[PDB]
Design a binder for these strands. Sequence first.
RNA 1: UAAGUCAGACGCAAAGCUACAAGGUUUCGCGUCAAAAGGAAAAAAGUCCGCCAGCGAGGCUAAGGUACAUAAA
RNA 2: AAUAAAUAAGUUUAAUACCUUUUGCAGCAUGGACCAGCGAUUAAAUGCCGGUAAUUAGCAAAGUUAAACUAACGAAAAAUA
Lengths: 32, 200, 51, 64, 50, 176, 51, 155, 105, 117, 121, 360
Amino acid sequence: XXXXXXXXXXXXXXXXXRXXXXXXXXXXXXXX
Amino acid sequence: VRTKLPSKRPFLQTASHLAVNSLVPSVRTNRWADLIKGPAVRSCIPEIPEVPKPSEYTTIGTIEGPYTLNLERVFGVVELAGSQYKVTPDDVIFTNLLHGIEVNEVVMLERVMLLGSRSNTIIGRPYIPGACVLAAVEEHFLDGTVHVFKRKKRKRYRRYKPTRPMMTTLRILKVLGIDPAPGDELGIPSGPVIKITNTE
Amino acid sequence: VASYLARICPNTYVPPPFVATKKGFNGIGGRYDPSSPFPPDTGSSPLTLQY
Amino acid sequence: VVFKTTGGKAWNPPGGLKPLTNTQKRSRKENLQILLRNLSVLKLAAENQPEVTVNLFSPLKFMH
Amino acid sequence: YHMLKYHKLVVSEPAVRLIEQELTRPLRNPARAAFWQEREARIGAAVEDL
Amino acid sequence: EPVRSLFVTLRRSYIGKAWFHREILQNFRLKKIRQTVEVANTPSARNSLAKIPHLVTIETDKMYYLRNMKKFYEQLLRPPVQVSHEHAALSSEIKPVHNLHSKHVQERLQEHAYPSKMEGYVLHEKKPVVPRALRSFAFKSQDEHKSFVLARLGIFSEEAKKIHLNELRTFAKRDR
Amino acid sequence: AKWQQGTHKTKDRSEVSGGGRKPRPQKGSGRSRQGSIRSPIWRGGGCTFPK
Amino acid sequence: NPNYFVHLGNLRPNPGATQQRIREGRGLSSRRGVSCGMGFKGQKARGRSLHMLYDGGQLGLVKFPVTRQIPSYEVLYNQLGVSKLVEFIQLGLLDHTKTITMKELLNAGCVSSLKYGVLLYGNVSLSFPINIEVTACDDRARRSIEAAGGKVTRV
Amino acid sequence: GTIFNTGVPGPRPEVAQKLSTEYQGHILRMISLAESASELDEVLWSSKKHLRPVHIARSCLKLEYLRTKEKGREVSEPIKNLASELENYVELYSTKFTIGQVSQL
Amino acid sequence: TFSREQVFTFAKNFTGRARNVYKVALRRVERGLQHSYVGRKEKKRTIRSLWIQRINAGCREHGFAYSALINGLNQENIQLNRKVLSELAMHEPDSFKAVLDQVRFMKGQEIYANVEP
Amino acid sequence: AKYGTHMLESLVFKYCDIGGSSRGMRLFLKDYMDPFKQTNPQLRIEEVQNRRRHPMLVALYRNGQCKPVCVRNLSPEEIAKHIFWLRNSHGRDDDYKVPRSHKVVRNESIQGTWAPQGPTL
Amino acid sequence: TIFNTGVPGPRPEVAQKLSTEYQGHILRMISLAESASELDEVLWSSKKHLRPVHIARSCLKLEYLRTKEKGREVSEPIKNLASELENYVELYSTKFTIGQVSQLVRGLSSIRRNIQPDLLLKLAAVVVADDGRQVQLANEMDCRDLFFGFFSQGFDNELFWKRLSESVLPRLPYFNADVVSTVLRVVSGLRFLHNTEFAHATMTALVPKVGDLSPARLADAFFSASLLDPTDVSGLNAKLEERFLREFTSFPIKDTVTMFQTVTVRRHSTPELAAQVAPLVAAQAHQLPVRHLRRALEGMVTAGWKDTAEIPLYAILAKQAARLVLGKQSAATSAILGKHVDNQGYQRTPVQLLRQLARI
RNA sequence: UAAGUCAGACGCAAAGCUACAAGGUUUCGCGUCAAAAGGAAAAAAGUCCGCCAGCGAGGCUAAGGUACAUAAA
RNA sequence: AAUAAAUAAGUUUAAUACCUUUUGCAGCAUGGACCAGCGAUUAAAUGCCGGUAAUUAGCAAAGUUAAACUAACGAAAAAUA
Ligand SMILES: [K+]
Ligand SMILES: [K+]
Ligand SMILES: [K+]
Ligand SMILES: [Mg+2]
Ligand SMILES: [Mg+2]
Ligand SMILES: [Mg+2]
Ligand SMILES: [Mg+2]
Ligand SMILES: [Mg+2]
Ligand SMILES: [Mg+2]
Ligand SMILES: [Mg+2]
Ligand SMILES: [Mg+2]
Ligand SMILES: [Mg+2]
Ligand SMILES: [Mg+2]
Ligand SMILES: [Mg+2]
Ligand SMILES: [Mg+2]
Ligand SMILES: [Mg+2]
């Protein structure tokens, strides 16, 4: 479960929320 | 045991075991716990990722000469040097010492938490992307002396240690991110002439 | 502030600072500190003059 | 705690040690729940121990 | 003390010879000093041969 | 799921605890409140932790990870929102601060917020007034010099005459 | 050090003139107790550690 | 003057060769500030009163017996080892082709200062004869010299 | 025992009769009776101001005897370090040794 | 021990013999400097108390409570501190109310970088 | 600087030519005096040679402040530290402390100060 | 008096990070690391106290670790550790010194890792900034690593090499022979420096002192000199040939093979030289990699040596080449050990080398 | 350190002496004071929480609190 | 204990001198009315233990004083001849 939870968080670019190409899909962080 | 002299029993026992080991070899030659001991690891759990934050302050240019400022009808909240400030153009704030900037330079502040006007308000959770505040560096100064004194009555104890804190002064120039309410637009030139010296 | 000379003279070359020691030699590393009030030494004890 | 009611030193107000308030009772209940919870966790660890112990890195052990 | 006090030092030829003679004179037992010098010379000669 | 390590956090201080319990905390290398360490799940470690269940909080590797990941997701940035409040009738006048009449508010503005006192050193230069108790220290050198001159050179001297001329100027300025 | 002459001297309480008698009674007067007028504490007294 | 000139105004001692004296009774923050490091009361803190060897009255050191044996007068002799005598001969400071007397030993430097005599002692393996005259000798030295063919005479 | 404090081995009569004597040579006996490399190093360190070529020759010869005791293994670290320090004294006294002393060295 | 110059500089505003008499002024100077160390520590406690009072007064004018607001902010991930919130209630009533409405009712319109994705 | 105008008006260097206490000042002048002048065209820099006991720095500001500083037995790096704080400050007195709110504003309220909701008297 | 009964048990095992008190031990710990995994743990524990000096030294350590694994592909842990050190270099890109940059490039070049083109430009700027003021402070070892390190990375910036050459030109006469040899290697490898004044200066500086050249450096110098200066304008090639003749027997097998091929290219080979080479090459044919075997075959064939019954060198070389291609040495050792399941790493030769050997 | 100290006090928990008294006295286990500022109980040496290198109008908590005095339902 | 930290200048909050002596002192325990000047581990010889150097020391001037050193078990065999 630790391996299956680290991957999901790793597949998230939080630094891309302050790049002006963003929409309401770059903040849908939790449930893809 | 009544005596307070430290006991030498551990020394006497060690000398006996050392003598036996030196002369009499052991029968076993392996230990399973040592044989299967694995490589050293940093931890047994995945590391916790960090939360990104906007840049604190960055230089964008310099000021050429004397200028003037007028009052506007917008305000904002910015986080800087460990504390928050409510700022509007032509305000003066005092902060801790900021490294890497010089007097008569223009800096850009991006950690904006709140923007407001007379007709609308924008709330960041916790920061507003695409907003910034401009300010001019005016001073790097030593503040007034603070006298630190300690004493303990009847104990012959006394200490004196004066000190001078280091601080920085800024003047707010412009707030970007929210439009003024209708009829509140400043329709004349307001700020200085800035020589841009930061291209990325 | 690592160096105040580099702050008041933004466009000049500032040589490396001299190594400060408890004993107080002026000739450490083959360099002489011009501000010292004593003749140059070899950076060790006993004190010997370095020309 | 102090239970003594005699002497000139006034450790307690006249009448001796005062009874606990409702907040104090709630405070002592929570301190015991934490202690009981810790013992429950150690029971889980003992029932789920692996065969081989994990080796953790330490800079000071590495140097020596 | 006098040498450090004054900036310049001027000496005569006979003075130079006398100064060097006194600064090299054996402190003790002139005879013993010569013996050790001779032995070192012989060792130095043997080293050259080898 | 095997439990491979334990996380131990300190809750209580060293003050007021028996010396045979402080040794256990030192073996785990806990020194500050809220400090955490990670240890291997072994029977010897569990026995020691059973002697001080009132000084620490204990959790397994899985519990520690889940708790910290829940906090991480809560602190992630979320979209900003805006709230509008319409005021149809607005005035164009800029009202002053309610304490503008105060001399202490004005002093702060004069010192830091206004383009004041930029006309030059000569215009704004002023001489400070020495406190009465500090005057024997401010003029010590001048008094010594006058004694030095009169003792060595005498009163029929050029230096003595200069001092007297300066004293005449000071006395004349007393009449105001 | 060799050239220093060292011809210097002072007087202690046993070398200053007078001072034999006890100047005040031990008790009763309300003053401090004293044993001699040439004590180091007194003006004109001897030196505690003479040269 | 250049920087490397030496005059009376730029001399200092070697670091570590000197240390400042402690002057006590000169302030709260000074070393040995008020009471000068002597404590508060008692006999030790009131000047020269107590000898450092007094033990309080038990007097434990004088509870032991006394011995009166007289040591031998030969402890007043200068001791010379046979191994040291050979080393001088090998280096060439002594002439082994003629009789060796105490005068030769004194001049060679084997013996420093003689008031009574010289005592010869020790064991050594010799390959050449030696004839030496001393004031005293043991048996180990006599056997060593005579084994090579020498002669030891007590004068 | 009775003579020394707890844990201190009692005297050996053979060693005691060697050290208790009317004749000089105390330092030579101390280095000759050393039983380990560390012990010999301490003797030389505490007697530095009185060492002579005869003392250096014996010290280097003792390295042969200590090595023999520690057989079944190569030269240990303490022996190597002790040998290095002795070499500095050999250089210092290189011009004062006799033929016999050089042979032992 | 302070010198005469230091003592009289500190005591220039003292009353009576405390101004120019060394023995009297010295003890008054040291006691005052002790007050200052305590004074700086207490200042940080008092100012935070004043902020909370002003925030609570503003909250209750609308029918809310201070403790409810602090909890509500943490659920929305809003990290404004008490110094800023105190100033908003006094000088920016409209913005302060907007924060309360978002926390209580959550009826704010979200803003995205791309208005039309 | 205030509104883009520098506040330091002049800087005077006083030193002796043979005194040992001025050794550090002489080194600074030899090596860094010229680069310092070029960086600060708006500053009037004056050097005074005299027979005084110790070197000194004197700073004069457009607001009438005078700040003499002693640089006795200091090295060029130590001298530069004093210059940095003198040039970049407004020259306020050593006993002055800035407002405790860390902000001075002329326009404190945009929307208006809070007022009671009712007929005042 | 007694509050616990029994013998004290084992101490608990606690995961710890490096403390600020031991920040001065980081360089020592890097040296004491004996594997990539250990070095990875050392850096991780000291993450909060890493400085540019530590990042540069770690990359240099990769060369030392990889040396123990010669004859095999670079291990995965080394590659993964390198991928992380590169990110640290990017953060500290502008805070390195000239001496530290040289260490970084050599370490990554030895591992055969290509640095990003943008990073090379930033690293190059550090070296040549301020009119090469810091180049006068780089020592001989730093200069050697800078020339070979950047050359091995495929750096092809004309401006960088122009400025770097100008600063080093006045220092060539005082450099050691081994350093000068490396400079010639770079000059010959860079086409635009073929006929510059710097190239001529390097040759003139090497001629006066050739007795100090090591075997490996001597072979490279002869190769580079022949290519750059076919006609002996400077007395370098003639002097190099004389040294080869005098000490032919003392040089190692690899250098003798390389130097012999150069002579044949120079057209100074003789039957006597070919006869003398054969007995030495035949005895030590097993000490030549595939690259040196190809050189030996071409040199002997050009010289005209013919197979002899006593010393059939061609037959021996063919067998040796087959062993290297097949990698039978690992299998042969496992046969004696008795465990044939032993893992066998290998470095497959390129098809181009196979064709060249087949034609020869 | 060939230094200082050899006048100790109280809280909880035991025993002897006293009267299963004393802020009594004699031993013993732990803690605090002595040599310890800060917070809670009214003032508060020894009880509860907790150990002060310095500055700041940032944040989270312990013991204890959450209609007024007096911060928070 | 006559001040401190702040302030919209109206005021609000914090806050029982110092020394000496004590288990413990705001102490109803001791000393000082205030200012200037004076006022207390110093010198010699000897011994012990660290630090820094000289590389024996002093006289005399090819010869003398002072100190220091001076036998413990002659134990290694590393030859791909
Ligand atoms: K506690
Ligand atoms: K003492
Ligand atoms: K008075
Ligand atoms: Mg009472
Ligand atoms: Mg609680
Ligand atoms: Mg007199
Ligand atoms: Mg007493
Ligand atoms: Mg005492
Ligand atoms: Mg007693
Ligand atoms: Mg007693
Ligand atoms: Mg009692
Ligand atoms: Mg006491
Ligand atoms: Mg809270
Ligand atoms: Mg309230
Ligand atoms: Mg009493
Ligand atoms: Mg009185």
